[PDB]
Nucleic acid binder design. Structure first.
Ligand SMILES: [Mn+2]
Ligand SMILES: [Mn+2]
Ligand SMILES: [Mn+2]
Ligand SMILES: [Mn+2]
Lengths: 163, 163
DNA sequence: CAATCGTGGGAGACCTTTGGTCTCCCTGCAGAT
DNA sequence: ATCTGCAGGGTCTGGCCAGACC
DNA sequence: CACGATTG
């Protein structure tokens, strides 16, 4: 009954579903660092691992993480950060005792009927609100689509269905 | 007394130096996976974690990892893998109780006088053989330059000097 | 703070800082000795 | 196996093609 | 997706 979902990008989130139906969602911790004399956001390694140590999810809990698949038209910094966020999350999840199952974005979108949307991030927040109504106040901003994708990944791995 | 050096690429290595002067060097564990219907080498996350947790180095031991600096002329997959390997190693080292200090490749090269070499991989192997003569049999192949790079990073953090 | 937009990008360490100069790692294939 | 050369590249799923996505 | 802006 324990399922973890991870949206790994810099505005992403981690969702935890418990066997009693309750859910948690945490924004991905980040820090500001200096790269090439400008400011960049990067995931906070220590806060991520400290977040995972304090979860009540037992070892062997499956973590469903979105498969890294950046676009060819994305720049090389987008490719680096997609890879960096992917490896940092996977290593943190494996070291915390969790079994990592990568899920393509096409898989959970087709599962919830979210393919070919004009507003995919808004539809994600709507679908996660319907699946997790106690998280509806945590999904009202446009920036909360990372929270929704983490919830939908965990909802996919748990086998929940929309009404 | 205890210093760890990490060369994070797919042919890289991790070197561990003990306060009695002895040394160990392990090739980076990897697996073959399928990406876009071809075979790719990716770092073996679970084997890296259990390698770090089998070390006798106490928690708080500083792990010097080569700083990520892919070239602008490198392709977007090289940027992805450089980022992925960097984040996978950093999260693995932090979760195992080690403190991570990134070191630019120019830093330990200048400290050992290896800059502007026409055969830099050969020179790293010869420099590591002189610093760690019980690893001379483990540095005889050209592919062993990742073992040398990890040994030299660890030698930089320990303050060793060449004769 | 929160949202929107347009394009896809290096980064780093000294030298003798206040910018300039110069340096450095790879991946992913194919083929050959 | 081990080394060399060279240019810098998507990847995925639902069934080689088609069409989808961060 | 990232990055480096601009918008109120
Ligand atoms: Mn995502
Ligand atoms: Mn996201
Ligand atoms: Mn290296
Ligand atoms: Mn290397």
């Amino acid at each position: 009954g324990w399922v973890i979902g991870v949206d790994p990008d810099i505005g992403g989130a981690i969702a935890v579903l418990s066997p009693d139906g309750s859910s948690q969602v945490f924004d991905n911790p980040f820090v500001h660092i200096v790269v090439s004399e400008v400011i960049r956001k990067r995931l906070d390694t220590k806060s991520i691992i400290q977040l995972l140590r304090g979860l009540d999810a037992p070892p062997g809990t499956t973590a469903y993480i979105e498969k890294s698949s950046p676009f060819p038209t994305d720049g090389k910094q987008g490719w680096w950060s997609t890879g960096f966020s992917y490896g940092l999350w996977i290593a943190s999840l494996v070291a915390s005792g969790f079994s990592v199952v990568p899920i393509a974005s096409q898989t959970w979108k087709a599962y919830f009927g979210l393919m070919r949307s004009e507003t995919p991030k808004d539809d994600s927040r709507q679908a996660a609100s319907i699946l997790f109504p106690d998280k509806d106040q945590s999904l009202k901003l446009k920036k909360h689509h990372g929270r929704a994708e983490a919830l939908l990944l965990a909802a996919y791995g748990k086998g929940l269905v929309l009404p």
